[PDB]
Amino acid sequence: ANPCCSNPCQNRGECMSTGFDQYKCDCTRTGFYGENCTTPEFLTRIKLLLKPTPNTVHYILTHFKGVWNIVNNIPFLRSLIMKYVLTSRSYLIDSPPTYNVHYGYKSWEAFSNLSYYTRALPPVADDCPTPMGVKGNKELPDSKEVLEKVLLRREFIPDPQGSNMMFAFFAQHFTHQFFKTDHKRGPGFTRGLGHGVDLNHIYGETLDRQHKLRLFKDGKLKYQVIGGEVYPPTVKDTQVEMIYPPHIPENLQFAVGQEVFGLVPGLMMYATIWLREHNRVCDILKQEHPEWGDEQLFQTSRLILIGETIKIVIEDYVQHLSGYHFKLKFDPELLFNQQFQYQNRIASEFNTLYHWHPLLPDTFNIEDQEYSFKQFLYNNSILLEHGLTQFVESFTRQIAGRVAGGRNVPIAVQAVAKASIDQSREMKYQSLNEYRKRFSLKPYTSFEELTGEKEMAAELKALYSDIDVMELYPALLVEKPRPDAIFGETMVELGAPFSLKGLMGNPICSPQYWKPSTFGGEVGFKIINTASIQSLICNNVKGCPFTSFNVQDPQPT
Amino acid sequence: ANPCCSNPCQNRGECMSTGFDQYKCDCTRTGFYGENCTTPEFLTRIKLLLKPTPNTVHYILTHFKGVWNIVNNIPFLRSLIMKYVLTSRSYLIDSPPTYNVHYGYKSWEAFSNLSYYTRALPPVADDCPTPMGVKGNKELPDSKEVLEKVLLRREFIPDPQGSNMMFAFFAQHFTHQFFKTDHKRGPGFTRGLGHGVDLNHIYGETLDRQHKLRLFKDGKLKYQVIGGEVYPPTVKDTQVEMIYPPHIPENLQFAVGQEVFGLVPGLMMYATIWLREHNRVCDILKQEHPEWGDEQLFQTSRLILIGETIKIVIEDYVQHLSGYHFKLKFDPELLFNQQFQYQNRIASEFNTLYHWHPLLPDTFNIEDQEYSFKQFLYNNSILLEHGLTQFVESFTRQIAGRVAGGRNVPIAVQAVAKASIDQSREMKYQSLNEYRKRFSLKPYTSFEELTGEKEMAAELKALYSDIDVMELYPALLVEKPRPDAIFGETMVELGAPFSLKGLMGNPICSPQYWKPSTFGGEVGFKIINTASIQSLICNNVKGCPFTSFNVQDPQPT
Ligand code: HEM
Ligand code: HEM
Ligand SMILES: *[C@@H]1O[C@H](CO)[C@@H](O[C@@H]2O[C@H](CO)[C@@H](O[C@@H]3O[C@H](CO)[C@@H](O)[C@H](O)[C@H]3NC(C)=O)[C@H](O)[C@H]2NC(C)=O)[C@H](O)[C@H]1NC(C)=O
Ligand SMILES: *[C@@H]1O[C@H](CO)[C@@H](O[C@@H]2O[C@H](CO)[C@@H](O[C@@H]3O[C@H](CO)[C@@H](O)[C@H](O)[C@H]3NC(C)=O)[C@H](O)[C@H]2NC(C)=O)[C@H](O)[C@H]1NC(C)=O
Ligand SMILES: CCCCCCNC(=O)Oc1cccc(-c2ccc([C@H](C)C(=O)O)cc2F)c1
Ligand SMILES: CCCCCCNC(=O)Oc1cccc(-c2ccc([C@H](C)C(=O)O)cc2F)c1
Ligand SMILES: CCCCCCCCO[C@@H]1O[C@H](CO)[C@@H](O)[C@H](O)[C@H]1O
Ligand SMILES: CCCCCCCCO[C@@H]1O[C@H](CO)[C@@H](O)[C@H](O)[C@H]1O
Ligand SMILES: CCCCCCCCO[C@@H]1O[C@H](CO)[C@@H](O)[C@H](O)[C@H]1O
Ligand SMILES: CCCCCCCCO[C@@H]1O[C@H](CO)[C@@H](O)[C@H](O)[C@H]1O
Ligand SMILES: *[C@@H]1O[C@H](CO)[C@@H](O)[C@H](O)[C@H]1NC(C)=O
Ligand SMILES: *[C@@H]1O[C@H](CO)[C@@H](O)[C@H](O)[C@H]1NC(C)=O
Ligand SMILES: *[C@@H]1O[C@H](CO)[C@@H](O)[C@H](O)[C@H]1NC(C)=O
Ligand SMILES: *[C@@H]1O[C@H](CO)[C@@H](O)[C@H](O)[C@H]1NC(C)=O
Fold it and tell me: Where O-acetylserine occurs along the chain (chains A, B)?
């Protein structure tokens, strides 16, 4: 019924009904005009003929290694390119945020209510004739059929880029501070009201939980030492709520910032490393500032650990998954002469695309054990039996699974994958091709073009009939990968804007925060600017073991 | 003990202790270097020799009327000047925000906890030898003595600029949506978590209160009609909490967005006008959009009323109090090619400086009655007896009191003025002269320079001894006024940055919001861009009475 159901407006123009059977497009600042915003302005058709495709740019960034080696050693050149990456990627994100699961038009409720995930594309209106708007059938294909035909793992497919379990569990640990769905309200809602990198997964979402986790001596978090090594405190000693099944011994009920981190030992490994790092930084600050009290030591260490996190995420984590020869840079100063909003709201679609469960292996291999999912889940005694050193040695050399390319969701978490499809529909997501247009990509014109193969393409065509009705989440996991890559085009071109905006939109990146005194002086500032995944593991894990996000990297002798 | 107690760092450099008896200043991006950040960079001393004083600029803006008449009719010139006003005023405000009453250093707690008012200058540390830091006595002068000697009204002093009760009650109504101190927590805390112009004073701070105030037909707010005219609903009909003394008849217990608006009929007059305006806009939108439901009509009318408010505040309200011949402009488009953060956090000092109780008259005169404070307070039957038309006619011609110039706080609210001094001390405010330096003003070198007279100056010198120990709040009210003006220098030069930043920092001013479709099309957009205090009263008060913020303005025949 809604005349905007067909999504007639292009190029980020906005649709508005103007009667029961009529619409108008608002083409303001789109670069286009005309009824559906498709006639380019003169300056726009020039930029269009000059702009290279994402696959062209990706080819360039992943070849000519010798030229990038030159560029990487010319600081002004490296800065210039990183600046463009930041600004061109951030422009794709609405900031201040706009739509959410209940509001397909801008409203004060959608702007001000922080309990919602925001939305990059508005939901399909309730009174539309079909799920995607006007295209398709009265119903989308059975989600269990989609799952089983093109999503479920047969044989484990490894990641050609070499991503390991250090990478997989870093992904899970990092993202779980800002993907925290509020299930009491629904899939369109979040419990992470900080909407970004605030490290609430280490410190607690609320003040009360934080104070239970703190020692109130020297800025430190509470801890215990077992077999000479430092671990989180227990729930019995702190009274912090954690999710643990009934049979776990009290001594194994570790209490950390995020209540669900007892779920797997891989999460608890990173929780332990960052706990140790917080207390390490406290001791360094206390040496510089014998005059400081506990509160300032705590707050300043937290700011430093936020900086470390963003530094590592950009220069090690995103660096690895990008596959680029260009050396990415964490440098807030790059945006001080640019237009940029230091704020962020977590988008629902960002959460959806980050469901990388194909990363998970068939078994978790530590030392000479091959733990099944049943044995690994909620078993912190595995963590104590082997210790972190052994964990790092094993996870560094265990390959993760490929995310794009299809048929690699492990059957142990199939219910989560089915839920991803279902809840996506529940939240009235627009189609894959609408999302592609939203992020300046060419719509796919067939399923074979989407997957780059024949067999899954044929399954999908039988289930969906029209490529314009294909859904976002299953498309991301069956998409044709880039050459020898873990992801396809749609994953990179949607994820990068959310990512970079999320990272640089943090207040510590703003001019009034980004200065030595914020972090306790040059010593604290330097901890941020020299941080790396290797130095994080080196400083806080016994023996300073070698690590990396890539199984292919040789350990030196 | 804290080596930063003397506030050694100048020019917005930040002080940090580096041991028990040593400090370092961080001069990053200040324009200065050296130990206390006082050696200007080459580009800085040039700008310094060229910059005109605030009193010089104010003279220019309030003379040469004939030249401004020319400038005002050259749109590109008017735009150019208004743009500079916005950017140069906004630069004075830390955004993202920094300090608060508990944090004299940057911290994630001060950034993320929206229950605090933010702070333009950090609090004096707890372990400082004196209240102001190092200067002064062990104690500040008795606040009751300060109050009685230089603050309390003897004879009513009228405002030379002609501000009337329409102006006074607009000030109280408008500001009370973002000055809402949380007394359960303390003077450094707020209940207005929107931190700006969200119109929570009409719609309610929470979703629950909002839904009790809504009709859920046509986007409208609940209402009743008495003697042919529209008034807010009752608490009995809505169950909305309001503050009312025990004896008020249920039929006179009007329920509006802000719970304290039953306090005076002047507040309830504006609450009634804006209630009528919301429902007026609903009917206009429903005519354009017969296909829209109640929720979209409600949300869109709210966005339109936010725009109207900012438009009126800038072009009528601030225009009047400024005294400028230059015609101020509400135009978000002026900032689209500038660096600007679309966000705002309400500062404690902004709240403090806006305590304009000298505005209040000795009696409130409506028709031929002269109501005392005792008779006026909580008496909504005064509102019904006379009606809004009569209220507008009387308040338009009743002069408000002068704010600067001293001795004009009415004795009916002296306890509020004493509390302002006390709570200011409680919140460990730095001195007047520190605040002046913070906003690029020359410190006063004597009390006579501050007041521009001899008698109050001598009282203050006996109470305070040193001008460097003079406090911010009493200084604002005794300060030498500009010629024939309601305020002194410190009030304008502190208030304008908070104001303009607060107004333009609203998300409806951002590029993705500021477009016709956000407001239901060109008809809704036009309601914002042609709004004025006269058209607000004309459209919603019976007979369309003449109004203005100035008693001096002639009504046409
Ligand atoms: C270690 C094994 C893992 C298991 C058993 C697991 C299982 C689950 C389950 C059951 C959920 C849904 C829980 C709920 O109802 O809220 C979930 C959510 C999620 N998982 Fe996994 N997961 C694992 C690892 C990972 C990894 C490696 C990633 C990659 C980033 C990941 C990303 C996510 C995301 C983004 C969510 C959504 C979280 C939210 O919205 O709150 N998980 N996982
Ligand atoms: C109509 C007569 C007025 C009365 C009886 C009055 C009385 C009061 C009182 C008693 C308070 C403190 C209440 C509390 O404990 O929170 C207060 C606060 C305040 N008043 Fe007035 N006032 C009046 C008008 C005005 C006017 C014209 C202004 C000018 C803007 C104004 C500005 C303020 C401000 C800014 C506050 C602080 C509010 C807060 O922090 O929550 N008031 N007023
Ligand atoms: C952000 O948006 C959320 C979604 O609209 C709001 O959550 C809704 O709050 C309603 C009350 O404010 C809840 O309804 C109430 O439920 C209780 C118990 O179930 C009843 O006693 C109430 O009568 C009932 N009222 C109504 C009108 O339904 C909703 O259940 C709840 N919705 C969801 C999906 O959780 C948030 O409150 C809002 N947050 C903020 C900060 O405004
Ligand atoms: C923003 O900052 C506020 C000031 O720090 C926080 O308010 C404080 O919350 C404490 C609990 O989180 C309150 O203390 C508790 O009071 C109750 C009852 O009085 C006791 O049961 C608790 O044991 C006690 N705990 C402690 C550690 O004191 C403080 O009274 C309260 N302070 C003030 C001034 O109100 C806000 O919680 C915080 N808001 C957010 C969103 O984090
Ligand atoms: C709220 C903070 C969120 C930050 C999440 C960081 N991103 C992340 O962890 O995973 C993701 C998820 C999806 C895409 C990306 C990503 C891929 C490529 C690039 C290169 C540099 C490019 O721009 O071309 C940048 C990216 F960011 C990262
Ligand atoms: C959160 C939103 C707050 C907005 C409050 C609006 N300001 C207000 O109502 O009162 C105030 C309070 C104090 C000063 C001013 C003010 C004075 C002069 C000027 C001119 C234009 C100049 O720049 O030179 C601008 C101003 F803003 C307004
Ligand atoms: C080749 C020199 C480095 C260029 C870095 C570009 C990084 C990402 O640039 C991206 O390119 C895409 C396709 O052009 C666009 O769709 C995105 O808007 C743009 O951000
Ligand atoms: C002149 C600058 C170098 C251009 C490099 C060739 C353009 C990129 O070649 C790319 O190859 C990919 C292989 O999977 C294809 O998927 C893309 O469609 C294609 O654009
Ligand atoms: C005279 C032409 C119009 C100029 C408008 C200036 C409006 C306010 O400009 C103010 O001037 C003050 C003194 O120079 C400075 O201290 C403030 O930073 C600046 O914002
Ligand atoms: C050359 C441009 C015109 C300059 C106008 C004269 C400078 C402003 O003259 C001002 O007069 C005020 C009167 O109260 C004084 O308080 C100020 O100190 C003074 O600067
Ligand atoms: C706009 O889109 C509609 C279908 O949604 C189409 O019928 C019409 O031709 C388009 N208008 C123009 C000018 O292309
Ligand atoms: C947990 O791991 C230990 C070995 O560390 C093993 O003995 C035990 O059976 C495991 N528990 C479960 C429930 O798998
Ligand atoms: C810095 O200020 C201190 C007093 O706080 C003063 O003693 C010192 O001389 C100043 N330093 C310089 C270089 O002016
Ligand atoms: C309220 O006003 C009415 C006149 O409108 C008057 O009769 C009454 O006495 C007033 N009440 C108080 C408590 O002053």
Answer: 548
